[PDB]
Scaffold this active site. Structure first.
Site, PDB file in Angstrom:
ATOM      1  N   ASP A 139      36.210  71.877  16.497  1.00  0.00           N
ATOM      2  CA  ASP A 139      35.850  72.845  17.504  1.00  0.00           C
ATOM      3  C   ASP A 139      36.894  73.971  17.603  1.00  0.00           C
ATOM      4  O   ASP A 139      37.100  74.538  18.662  1.00  0.00           O
ATOM      5  CB  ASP A 139      35.656  72.198  18.892  1.00  0.00           C
ATOM      6  CG  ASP A 139      35.015  73.106  19.887  1.00  0.00           C
ATOM      7  OD1 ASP A 139      34.208  73.990  19.559  1.00  0.00           O
ATOM      8  OD2 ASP A 139      35.262  72.839  21.093  1.00  0.00           O
ATOM      9  N   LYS A 142      35.771  78.869  13.495  1.00  0.00           N
ATOM     10  CA  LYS A 142      34.622  78.370  12.760  1.00  0.00           C
ATOM     11  C   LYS A 142      34.792  78.501  11.243  1.00  0.00           C
ATOM     12  O   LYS A 142      34.295  77.692  10.503  1.00  0.00           O
ATOM     13  CB  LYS A 142      33.334  79.014  13.212  1.00  0.00           C
ATOM     14  CG  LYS A 142      33.080  78.967  14.749  1.00  0.00           C
ATOM     15  CD  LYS A 142      33.353  77.594  15.356  1.00  0.00           C
ATOM     16  CE  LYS A 142      33.497  77.624  16.875  1.00  0.00           C
ATOM     17  NZ  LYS A 142      34.173  76.417  17.410  1.00  0.00           N
ATOM     18  N   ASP A 167      31.127  71.099  16.471  1.00  0.00           N
ATOM     19  CA  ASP A 167      30.504  71.920  17.480  1.00  0.00           C
ATOM     20  C   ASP A 167      30.053  73.251  16.877  1.00  0.00           C
ATOM     21  O   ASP A 167      30.608  73.726  15.887  1.00  0.00           O
ATOM     22  CB  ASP A 167      31.495  72.193  18.648  1.00  0.00           C
ATOM     23  CG  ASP A 167      30.802  72.781  19.871  1.00  0.00           C
ATOM     24  OD1 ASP A 167      29.601  72.547  20.037  1.00  0.00           O
ATOM     25  OD2 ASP A 167      31.467  73.529  20.657  1.00  0.00           O
ATOM     26  N   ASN A 168      29.086  73.890  17.508  1.00  0.00           N
ATOM     27  CA  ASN A 168      28.772  75.300  17.290  1.00  0.00           C
ATOM     28  C   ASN A 168      28.177  75.566  15.912  1.00  0.00           C
ATOM     29  O   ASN A 168      28.343  76.652  15.363  1.00  0.00           O
ATOM     30  CB  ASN A 168      29.950  76.203  17.498  1.00  0.00           C
ATOM     31  CG  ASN A 168      30.572  76.058  18.848  1.00  0.00           C
ATOM     32  OD1 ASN A 168      31.753  75.673  18.965  1.00  0.00           O
ATOM     33  ND2 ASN A 168      29.798  76.326  19.903  1.00  0.00           N
ATOM     34  N   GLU A 197      27.192  75.951  25.694  1.00  0.00           N
ATOM     35  CA  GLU A 197      27.780  75.692  26.979  1.00  0.00           C
ATOM     36  C   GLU A 197      27.403  76.751  27.983  1.00  0.00           C
ATOM     37  O   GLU A 197      27.592  77.946  27.780  1.00  0.00           O
ATOM     38  CB  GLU A 197      29.266  75.506  26.854  1.00  0.00           C
ATOM     39  CG  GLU A 197      30.023  76.641  26.148  1.00  0.00           C
ATOM     40  CD  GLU A 197      30.283  76.398  24.662  1.00  0.00           C
ATOM     41  OE1 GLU A 197      29.435  75.775  23.982  1.00  0.00           O
ATOM     42  OE2 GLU A 197      31.346  76.850  24.192  1.00  0.00           O
TER      43      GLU A 197
HETATM   44  C1  LIG Z   1      42.860  77.115  12.266  1.00  0.00           C
HETATM   45  N1  LIG Z   1      43.681  76.029  12.793  1.00  0.00           N
HETATM   46  C2  LIG Z   1      43.772  75.780  14.154  1.00  0.00           C
HETATM   47  N2  LIG Z   1      44.548  74.771  14.481  1.00  0.00           N
HETATM   48  C3  LIG Z   1      44.699  74.459  15.782  1.00  0.00           C
HETATM   49  N3  LIG Z   1      44.136  75.086  16.806  1.00  0.00           N
HETATM   50  C4  LIG Z   1      43.321  76.090  16.426  1.00  0.00           C
HETATM   51  C5  LIG Z   1      43.084  76.506  15.135  1.00  0.00           C
HETATM   52  N4  LIG Z   1      42.172  77.550  15.133  1.00  0.00           N
HETATM   53  C6  LIG Z   1      41.900  77.781  16.389  1.00  0.00           C
HETATM   54  N5  LIG Z   1      42.579  76.918  17.234  1.00  0.00           N
HETATM   55  C7  LIG Z   1      42.393  76.783  18.679  1.00  0.00           C
HETATM   56  O1  LIG Z   1      41.024  76.298  18.849  1.00  0.00           O
HETATM   57  C8  LIG Z   1      40.370  77.082  19.889  1.00  0.00           C
HETATM   58  C9  LIG Z   1      39.398  78.058  19.343  1.00  0.00           C
HETATM   59  C10 LIG Z   1      38.111  77.809  19.212  1.00  0.00           C
HETATM   60  C11 LIG Z   1      37.139  78.794  18.664  1.00  0.00           C
HETATM   61  N6  LIG Z   1      35.876  78.580  19.325  1.00  0.00           N
HETATM   62  C12 LIG Z   1      34.919  79.555  19.332  1.00  0.00           C
HETATM   63  O2  LIG Z   1      35.124  80.626  18.771  1.00  0.00           O
HETATM   64  C13 LIG Z   1      33.754  79.286  20.124  1.00  0.00           C
HETATM   65  C14 LIG Z   1      32.910  80.387  20.417  1.00  0.00           C
HETATM   66  C15 LIG Z   1      31.773  80.239  21.244  1.00  0.00           C
HETATM   67  C16 LIG Z   1      30.894  81.379  21.535  1.00  0.00           C
HETATM   68  C17 LIG Z   1      29.508  81.255  21.568  1.00  0.00           C
HETATM   69  C18 LIG Z   1      28.668  82.359  21.859  1.00  0.00           C
HETATM   70  C19 LIG Z   1      29.296  83.549  22.060  1.00  0.00           C
HETATM   71  F1  LIG Z   1      28.512  84.639  22.370  1.00  0.00           F
HETATM   72  C20 LIG Z   1      30.638  83.725  22.037  1.00  0.00           C
HETATM   73  C21 LIG Z   1      31.431  82.635  21.724  1.00  0.00           C
HETATM   74  C22 LIG Z   1      31.377  78.928  21.659  1.00  0.00           C
HETATM   75  C23 LIG Z   1      32.194  77.835  21.359  1.00  0.00           C
HETATM   76  O3  LIG Z   1      31.841  76.564  21.775  1.00  0.00           O
HETATM   77  C24 LIG Z   1      33.350  78.003  20.577  1.00  0.00           C
HETATM   78  O4  LIG Z   1      34.017  76.850  20.250  1.00  0.00           O
HETATM   79  C25 LIG Z   1      41.486  77.819  20.623  1.00  0.00           C
HETATM   80  O5  LIG Z   1      42.078  76.965  21.625  1.00  0.00           O
HETATM   81  C26 LIG Z   1      42.445  78.058  19.458  1.00  0.00           C
HETATM   82  O6  LIG Z   1      43.801  78.353  19.833  1.00  0.00           O
HETATM   83 CL   LIG Z   2      26.329  73.024  29.594  1.00  0.00          CL
HETATM   84 MG   LIG Z   3      32.861  75.116  20.678  1.00  0.00          MG
END
Ligand SMILES: CNc1ncnc2c1ncn2[C@@H]1O[C@H](/C=C/CNC(=O)c2cc(-c3ccc(F)cc3)cc(O)c2O)[C@@H](O)[C@H]1O
Ligand SMILES: [Cl-]
Ligand SMILES: [Mg+2]
Ligand SMILES: [Cl-]
Ligand SMILES: [Cl-]
EC number: 2.1.1.6
Length: 213
Positions: A139, A142, A167-168, A197
């Site tokens: 999660d 992506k 997820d997603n 969500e």
């Molecule tokens: C790449 N290695 C990594 N290692 C550890 N942590 C990492 C990470 N990449 C990102 N992260 C962390 O994960 C999280 C990021 C998640 C990215 N999630 C999304 O983009 C997301 C985006 C949406 C979304 C859905 C519809 C929309 F219109 C706009 C956004 C819905 C979701 O459920 C999502 O999960 C942050 O906490 C980030 O700091």
């Molecule tokens: Cl929900």
């Molecule tokens: Mg998500």
């Protein structure tokens, strides 16, 4: 002052310490009535819960903690002695997640590591004495689902039967990952259709069970 900190403060002002369900409820309330945030949410969360209960994993890896919602969700369902390792690259979010878990009373079941998955995954066997993972929840960014799945395999962290849960897979989508696991003989896949969500928009989870090399 950030949205994530506002979510944490709302939980501190509206939930009960030591009560994981009250924490999930407060987050869901805040994010429905005040400000949307990218927590898995209750609709997909209920599917996660059903999958966790089915497999009873002893060791779960989570990629991307954010505010800690899914870490609370999963950790509350682990059996005594089972553990969650969660990776979160953003130091602020890692601290929020730890505080969320502390508030929920779940800290003994979880280890929150502040670093990027690509740096930490290769350390899990040596530094953390991990053999193999029973379940992985994806999660994070992506475009990193597929790279990190391939890295997990290279590092010997998947066993025959390891459950990946992503997820997603519809919105925003993870097209390379989804095509890859569905096309590969090394994964058996199941799609669980649900909703984004806090929104009336279709989304889904993919379960991909590793079959061995
Ligand atoms: C790449 N290695 C990594 N290692 C550890 N942590 C990492 C990470 N990449 C990102 N992260 C962390 O994960 C999280 C990021 C998640 C990215 N999630 C999304 O983009 C997301 C985006 C949406 C979304 C859905 C519809 C929309 F219109 C706009 C956004 C819905 C979701 O459920 C999502 O999960 C942050 O906490 C980030 O700091
Ligand atoms: Cl929900
Ligand atoms: Mg998500
Ligand atoms: Cl088990
Ligand atoms: Cl397949």
């Amino acid at each position: 002052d950030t949205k994530e900190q506002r979510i944490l403060r709302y939980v501190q002002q509206n939930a009960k310490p030591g009560d994981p369900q009250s924490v999930l409820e407060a987050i869901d309330t805040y994010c429905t009535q005040k400000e949307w945030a990218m927590n898995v949410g209750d609709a997909k969360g209920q599917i996660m819960d059903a999958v966790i209960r089915e497999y009873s994993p002893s060791l779960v890896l989570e990629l991307g903690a954010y505010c800690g919602y899914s870490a609370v969700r999963m950790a509350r369902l682990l059996q005594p002695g089972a553990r969650l390792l969660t990776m979160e690259m953003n130091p602020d979010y890692a601290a929020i997640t730890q505080q969320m878990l502390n508030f929920a009373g779940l800290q003994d079941k979880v280890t929150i590591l502040n670093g990027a998955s690509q740096d930490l995954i290769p350390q899990l066997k040596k530094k953390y004495d991990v053999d193999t993972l029973d379940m992985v929840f994806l999660d994070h960014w992506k475009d990193r689902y597929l790279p990190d799945t391939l890295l997990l395999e290279k590092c010997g962290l998947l066993r025959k039967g390891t459950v990946l849960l992503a997820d997603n897979v519809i919105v925003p989508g993870t097209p390379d990952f989804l095509a890859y696991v569905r096309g590969s003989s090394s994964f058996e896949c199941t799609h669980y259709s649900s909703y984004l969500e806090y929104m009336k928009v279709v989304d889904g989870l993919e379960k991909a069970i590793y079959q061995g090399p």
